[PDB]
Design a protein around this ligand. Structure first.
Ligand code: NAG
Lengths: 50, 49
């Protein structure tokens, strides 16, 4: 599946995971999406038309 | 010495049992606290972040 829980399946936004076995345990590989470059824009709650 | 040693072993065994009992209870309580801490950490991530 795909989790929406914060930090449950790794940092960033979760996309998918893959298990790998290990002695006495399990290792998960968690694939996530992380925002990168960003820009500063002006904003507003609403646009007034007519 | 001979007689004192007998009386002392009775006290040592008893004293040691008291310490073992203490430690066992601390291990059990620590486990309960750990569960609470894990829950608190989950809430921090899902409720605060
Ligand atoms: C956005 O504005 C802040 C405040 O002036 C500034 O410190 C920051 O470097 C700017 N940056 C971006 C989008 O990288």
């Amino acid at each position: 599946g795909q989790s929406k829980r914060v930090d449950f399946c790794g940092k960033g936004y979760h996309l998918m995971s893959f298990p790998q076995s290990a002695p006495h345990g399990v290792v998960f590989l968690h694939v996530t999406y992380v925002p990168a470059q960003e820009k500063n824009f002006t904003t507003a709650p609403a646009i007034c038309h007519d | 010495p001979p007689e004192a040693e007998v009386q002392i072993d009775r006290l040592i065994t008893g004293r040691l049992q008291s310490l073992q009992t203490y430690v066992t209870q601390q291990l059990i309580r620590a486990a309960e606290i750990r569960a609470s801490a894990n829950l608190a950490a989950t809430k921090m991530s899902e409720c605060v972040l």
